[PDB]
Design a protein around this ligand. Structure first.
Ligand SMILES: CCCCCCCCCCCCCCCCCC(=O)OC[C@H](COP(=O)(O)OCCN)OC(=O)CCCCCCCCCCCCCCCCC
Ligand SMILES: NC(=O)C1=CN([C@@H]2O[C@H](COP(=O)(O)OP(=O)(O)OC[C@H]3O[C@@H](n4cnc5c(N)ncnc54)[C@H](OP(=O)(O)O)[C@@H]3O)[C@@H](O)[C@H]2O)C=CC1
Ligand SMILES: CCCCCCCCCCCCCC(=O)SCCNC(=O)CCNC(=O)[C@@H](O)C(C)(C)COP(=O)(O)O
Ligand code: SF4
Ligand code: SF4
Ligand code: SF4
Ligand SMILES: [Zn+2]
Lengths: 48, 114, 156, 95, 297, 208, 176, 146
């Protein structure tokens, strides 16, 4: 990369991180979607 | 309705083979509890054998019970020769499984299964 | 304190001897055995890390589960695991040992060896290369390097 | 343009964040929620609208065979720009 | 009730039970089988561990992916306890030592740590709390163990008023220190009467106490079905095991009789039938081999 | 149709059609169909009472000499009343040729074991017991060969599910690998991929 | 068109008989084996010094997955689900919706790296070069669920390795 | 396009009135017990039912049998059909007796008091297909709707 540098981008990591597994910086998976079914919210006023 | 048999000509020879397979299992159960060092009693294993024979008691087809006798001889052969481990013998006893809901109301409470 | 320094240095000593003398028992289940045989081949050479080639399962220190675990062999895997002396470690090599892999939805495949044995290092690939498996072995060595058996024993 | 819930959790580019009373935040306890802080919806907004003198423009995302399938965009509406369906680069007829 | 904590599935490994459980002391003997029976339902089990992570490895195949969250904690750090219990809907305490150590005595393990866990679990909004005392816990007891455990039970009862407190008598099992104590002692026989309870019965009682809403604020006494004298119990242990580390607190507790508390419910009021000693003692003591049953009272 | 199309072998097609007529007229007691594929493979569909007389013929006859059993196969086709299709693949090293002997059975009718003709069949049809449930009569050691020891069901039957009914895990309560009913954390996603337009007009079946 | 391995009838003259007997009594082929082993003792071994020296790879190498971006920051994935229709392991789970500017974009892009067979049908089925299987092979984890990548982890692998991935695609794309 | 109301405003858990008079979530045991304790205290006209617009015949005959154990016949629908005369005894005076398909066989259709474009839009599509291909004569008694 000193002779032929990589083509720069605004989104490439300027700080390369090594393998973070076993550290508190490790990856934890999760569902990246929102909630599908919406529940009914009962009225906060009395019914009499 | 004229079919080729497996071993039995009618249900009497079929019940004879069922009965001899039951004799072989009944004799084998104490040896199985000993050499697999199972934590069940001999009576508990013999009750399991009686359960596995009464589960198929509704069958009136000689070919179907001939295949049940053949598969029972195969299971017995896997038991006597130590081909099963302790785990394969104890899979007849569904011991880690929680008891299933039986009546309507508990099946209603747990979920959607009929 | 003084005893905290002593248990720190003794942890460093015993972790050095345990990570620098790993003895693997490799389950040659499937295609991952070929790539473990390349991790023992001259290019990568596990033996220069103190990682011997094919220790017996009763003197080995780590069990490399290299291949597909089926339902017919899972009690044999658990038997060999129970017969290992402690400290014993488990490297899961390849997708079938990790999570079932290409045979995940099969009727006869244990969906990952972690349903059977506790796994320390999950090495991903189909197969992971001999360089990637050697990476997983060195990550296991780094995991042993930060063990605190005597420090936690001193603090209990 | 990452933002933050009242729980302190980062909201992703989808809009995903756990509720406060959701137990599944316990997976990030002692660890981190890996989010990507380059939101593509903001990064394609940063691109300028290309003034072209044609009526139909072709976009392949640049790079030739390293972009997307080449599409043709009509520029006869003057209220709306002509947005590419693949790369989001939007075009305008200059007249 | 939140949508993620609604139960789903058929109660298997990949199912959802809606039980978000923080088991303090899961690295021990009761926590082993408790995390087993929780994780096989599909419960979110949080394991706060104090020890080496290696000594938690057996807890890892006990549930589905992500259903056991290991995290560090200290008994004298309330911040770590809050970090462990702030998402749980049930907190089970199982912290115990048969012997007092240099950094923790019985007052630390049985009084300070359970009151800290119960206070932090009260002020974090945890619905259910389960405490595990001993059957023979008494202020005027001969052993320091049972005195401090009676003190800690009183403190847990007065800082979590709905705490299900459970009294096992003498838990036997594979990794126990009751039948494995007697098989490796090679103390004596007195007028001491015991009814030992089986560990799977205790685990089913704890999980049915989670599932029963009426078990809140109660106090259960998990006892075995058969009361034995100490002497013929020890002779039955040496009869099954094919035979011809201690302190005086354990000597006082082995010669302490298992009391009878009929005013407290037991295993049967949670729906658990008590498994007798003779159906499981061969399973326990088969490891010690290189039988006429014991006399009940 | 030169570069991208497979060349047709008319010489082998004529020779295999002639030898199929030969086998069909020597053994009319059992031969039900004889067909030759467009890529020149001869299939002799026979009656299941003539498994041994046909195969002993092709193995021993001086114009056949099918001395090799390459493969033995069952195929579950549930829309037939005889759902299992037993397929013998035979190799004549003398005449440098291959033949296919096909027959049928259902779950309950036994097929005669061909270990008296090809001892190679000893495991193959045993695998047909394990995967499909077809029983083979007068077999030396008929038992399972590939499934686990307590395995219920025959897996390559098409009514058997992809994942099974049970799955294993280690359980530390009973200190044992145990079987439980199968639950998948992600279900196998079923893809309906078939196009509603007819792909091959040559294979069109006549309507009702 | 064939040859006979081991069909040599040996000579029975006293010369060859005494040659074979001297081979029997003086262990000629055993010293030949010792000579070949001694020959490899003085060869330079083939051992590279890992981790400092690395095994040689090609730009086609199929390692860790990464979701890419166009050279403006816009992500290349237009939510078309070809990579999960082609996926032989069904390792890819995709759910999509129109985002706030109306672009066809994913909300769920999961790859189970423990189902994945690393065969690269996703990168060759992708019409817009979004999913690629990059050059990273040293990504072993300590936990099973760390190998269950969501869209955030894959876009971070893209942002992490783009300077290498773009050059590998640049070196290989005229073979594709 | 109404399948997305099928994922909003949904009832997911049993609700009972708490001590403040508000609906709070509860279990099935509590909710079924608090309904059944009131159902055991009813008899005759003390209990009745209203059937909504989207109820299957299984739940309809279920609740009919349940209220007939209490000796209650008062089970109603929202949509008013007159019980005068034959009522709901003969099926012929509350059905589309011809058929939806029978519109293709008619020659004169008289629509009375209905706007079938929005009340039964594919029934109106069948009337339009008969209008187009069979020269159907349609008359409407009611407001001049489109
Ligand atoms: C009161 C306080 C003291 C308490 C008692 C302790 C007395 C002294 C005991 C020995 C020294 C203890 C410290 C051990 C090493 C700690 C530092 C360490 O781990 O250094 C790592 C370094 C190699 O780095 P590494 O991580 O392997 O990197 C891989 C390659 N890049 O490692 C190295 O460079 C090599 C490390 C060698 C360790 C020491 C040598 C072996 C032990 C000799 C003494 C004991 C055995 C005596 C003889 C036994 C029978 C033969
Ligand atoms: N026979 C029995 O087992 C019976 C037990 N009980 C009670 O049940 C409870 C659990 O019993 P049991 O499993 O057998 O006991 P164990 O000693 O086997 O387990 C105790 C657990 O608590 C942890 N722990 C102990 N001391 C501390 C401390 N100072 N700080 C933090 N964690 C600590 C241990 O972790 P680590 O490994 O890190 O030390 C372990 O996980 C105890 O309170 C005991 O008194 C009651 C009746 C019978
Ligand atoms: C320890 C675990 C061991 C597990 C052993 C499992 C072995 C399973 C073997 C099962 C083989 C069979 O089920 S064959 C039974 C099928 N028979 C029939 O359907 C005919 C009905 N059979 C009967 O009624 C039998 O009671 C008798 C004895 C044959 C006749 O009784 P009837 O007269 O009144
Ligand atoms: S993960 Fe793949 S390549 Fe590796 S052993 Fe399994 S099937 Fe073979
Ligand atoms: S990664 Fe490519 S193939 Fe997969 S959905 Fe996105 S654009 Fe389509
Ligand atoms: S490399 Fe193959 S198995 Fe892996 S995600 Fe891509 S298509 Fe699926
Ligand atoms: Zn474009």
């Amino acid at each position: 990369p000193t002779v032929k540098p990589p083509t720069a981008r605004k989104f490439i990591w300027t700080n390369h991180k090594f393998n973070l597994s076993g550290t508190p910086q490790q990856y934890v998976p999760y569902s990246t979607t929102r909630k599908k079914i919406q529940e009914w919210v009962p009225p906060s006023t009395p019914y009499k | 309705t004229s079919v080729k048999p497996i071993f039995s000509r009618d249900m009497n020879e079929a019940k004879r083979r069922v009965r001899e397979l039951y004799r072989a299992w009944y004799r084998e159960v104490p040896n199985t509890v000993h050499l697999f060092q199972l934590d069940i009693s001999v009576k508990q294993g013999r009750d399991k054998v009686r359960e596995m024979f009464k589960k198929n008691a509704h069958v009136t087809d000689p070919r179907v019970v001939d295949l049940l006798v053949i598969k029972g001889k195969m299971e017995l052969e896997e038991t006597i020769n130590v081909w099963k481990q302790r785990t394969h013998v104890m899979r007849f006893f569904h011991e880690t499984e929680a008891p299933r809901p039986k009546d309507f109301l508990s099946k209603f409470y747990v979920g959607h299964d009929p | 304190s003084r005893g905290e320094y002593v248990v720190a240095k003794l942890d460093d000593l015993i972790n050095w001897a345990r990570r620098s003398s790993l003895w693997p028992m490799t389950f040659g289940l499937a295609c991952c055995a070929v790539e473990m045989m390349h991790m023992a081949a001259p290019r990568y050479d596990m033996d220069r890390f103190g990682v011997v080639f094919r220790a017996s399962p009763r003197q080995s220190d780590v069990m490399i589960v290299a291949g597909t675990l089926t339902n017919k062999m899972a009690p044999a895997l658990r038997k060999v695991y129970d017969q290992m002396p402690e400290p014993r470690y488990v490297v899961s090599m390849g997708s079938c040992a990790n999570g079932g892999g290409y045979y995940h939805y099969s009727y006869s495949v244990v969906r990952g060896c972690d349903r059977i044995v506790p796994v320390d290092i999950y090495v991903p690939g189909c197969p992971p290369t001999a360089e990637a498996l050697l990476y997983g072995i060195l990550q296991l060595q780094k995991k042993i390097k930060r063990e605190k058996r005597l420090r936690i024993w001193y603090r209990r | 343009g990452v933002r933050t819930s009242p729980t302190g959790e980062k909201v992703t580019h989808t809009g995903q964040v756990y509720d406060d009373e959701d137990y599944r935040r316990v997976r990030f306890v002692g660890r981190q929620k890996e989010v990507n802080e380059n939101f593509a919806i903001d990064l394609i907004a940063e691109q300028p609208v290309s003034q072209v003198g044609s009526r139909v423009i072709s976009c392949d995302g640049g790079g030739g065979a390293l972009g997307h399938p080449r599409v043709y965009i009509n520029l006869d509406k003057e209220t709306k720009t002509g947005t590419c369906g693949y790369c989001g680069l939007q075009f305008r007829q200059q007249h | 009730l939140h949508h993620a904590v609604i139960p789903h599935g058929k109660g298997g490994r990949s199912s959802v039970s809606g039980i978000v459980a923080t088991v303090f002391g899961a690295t021990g003997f009761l926590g082993r089988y408790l995390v087993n029976h929780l994780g096989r339902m599909g419960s979110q089990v949080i394991v706060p561990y104090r020890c080496e992570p290696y000594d938690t490895m057996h807890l890892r195949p006990m549930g589905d992916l992500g259903q056991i969250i290991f995290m560090d904690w200290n008994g004298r750090d309330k911040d770590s306890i809050r970090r462990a219990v702030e998402h749980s809907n049930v907190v089970i305490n199982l912290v115990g030592r048969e012997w007092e150590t240099k950094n923790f005595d019985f007052e630390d393990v049985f009084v300070k740590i359970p009151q800290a866990i119960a206070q932090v679990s009260k002020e974090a909004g945890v619905e259910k709390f389960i405490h595990i005392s001993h059957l023979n816990a008494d202020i005027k007891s001969s052993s320091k163990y049972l005195r401090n455990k009676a003190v800690g039970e009183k403190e847990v009862r007065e800082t979590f008023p709905e705490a299900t407190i459970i009294k096992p008598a003498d838990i036997f099992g594979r990794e126990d220190r009751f039948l494995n104590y007697f098989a490796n002692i090679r103390s004596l026989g007195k007028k001491t009467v015991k009814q030992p309870v089986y560990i799977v019965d205790v685990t089913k009682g704890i999980i049915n106490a989670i599932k029963d809403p009426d078990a809140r604020g109660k106090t259960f006494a998990f006892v075995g079905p058969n009361r034995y004298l100490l002497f013929d119990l020890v002779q039955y242990v040496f009869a099954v095991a094919h035979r011809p580390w201690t302190t005086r607190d354990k000597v006082e507790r082995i010669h302490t009789t298992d009391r009878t508390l009929p005013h407290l419910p037991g295993l049967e009021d949670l729906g658990v039938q008590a498994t007798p000693l003779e159906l499981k003692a061969i399973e326990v003591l088969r490891r010690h081999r290189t039988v006429q049953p014991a006399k009940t009272v | 149709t030169r570069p991208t199309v497979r060349p047709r072998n008319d010489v082998a097609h004529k020779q295999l059609s002639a030898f199929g007529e030969y086998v069909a007229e020597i053994l009319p007691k059992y031969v039900q169909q004889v067909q030759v594929s467009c890529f020149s493979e001869l299939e002799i569909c026979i009656h299941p009472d003539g498994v041994i007389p046909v195969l002993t013929f092709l193995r021993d006859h001086s114009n056949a000499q099918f001395k090799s059993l390459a493969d033995l196969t069952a195929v579950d086709i549930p829309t037939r009343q005889n759902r299992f299709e037993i397929v013998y693949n035979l190799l004549s090293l003398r005449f440098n040729s291959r033949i296919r002997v096909k027959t049928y059975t259902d779950e309950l009718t036994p097929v005669e074991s061909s270990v008296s003709v090809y001892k190679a069949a000893n495991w193959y049809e045993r695998e047909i017991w394990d995967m499909f449930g077809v029983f083979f009569a007068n077999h030396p050691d008929l038992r399972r060969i590939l499934t686990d020891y307590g395995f219920e069901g025959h897996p390559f039957r098409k009514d058997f599910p992809l994942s099974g009914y049970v799955e294993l895990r280690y359980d530390d309560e009973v200190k044992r690998v145990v079987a439980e009913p199968v639950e998948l954390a992600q279900e196998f996603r079923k893809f309906d991929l078939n196009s509603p337009w007819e792909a091959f007009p040559a294979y069109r079946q006549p309507p009702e | 068109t064939y040859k006979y391995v081991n069909l040599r009838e040996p000579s029975m003259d006293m010369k060859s008989v005494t040659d074979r007997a001297a081979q029997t009594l003086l262990w000629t082929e055993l010293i030949r084996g010792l000579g070949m082993t001694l020959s490899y003792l003085f060869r330079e071994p083939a051992t590279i010094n890992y981790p400092f020296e690395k095994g040689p790879l090609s730009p086609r190498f199929r390692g860790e997955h990464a979701l890419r971006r166009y050279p403006s920051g816009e992500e290349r994935c237009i939510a078309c689900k070809l990579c999960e229709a082609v996926c032989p392991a069904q390792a890819i789970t995709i759910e999509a919706e129109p985002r706030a500017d109306g672009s066809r974009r994913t909300t769920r892009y999961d790859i189970d790296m423990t189902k994945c067979i690393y065969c690269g049908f996703c990168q060759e089925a992708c019409p817009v070069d979004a999913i690629v299987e990059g050059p990273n092979f040293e990504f072993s984890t300590e936990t099973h669920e760390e190998l269950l990548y969501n869209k955030e982890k894959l876009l971070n692998n893209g942002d992490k390795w783009e300077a290498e991935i773009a050059a590998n695609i640049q070196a290989d794309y005229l073979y594709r | 396009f109404a399948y997305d109301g099928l994922k909003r405003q949904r009832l997911t858990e049993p609700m009972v009135r708490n001590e403040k008079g508000l609906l709070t979530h509860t279990t099935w045991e509590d909710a079924l017990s608090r309904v059944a304790g009131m159902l055991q205290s009813c008899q005759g006209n003390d209990v009745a039912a209203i059937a909504g617009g989207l109820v299957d015949a299984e739940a309809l005959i279920a609740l009919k049998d349940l209220l007939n154990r209490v000796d209650s016949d008062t089970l109603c629908t929202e949509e008013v059909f007159p019980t005068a005369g034959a009522g709901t005894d003969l099926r012929s005076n509350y059905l589309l007796n011809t058929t939806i398909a029978g519109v293709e066989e008619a020659d004169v259709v008289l629509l009375v008091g209905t706007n079938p474009r929005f009340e039964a839009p594919l029934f109106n599509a069948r009337i339009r297909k008969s209008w187009l291909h069979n020269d159907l004569k349609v008359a409407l008694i009611g407001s001049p709707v489109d």
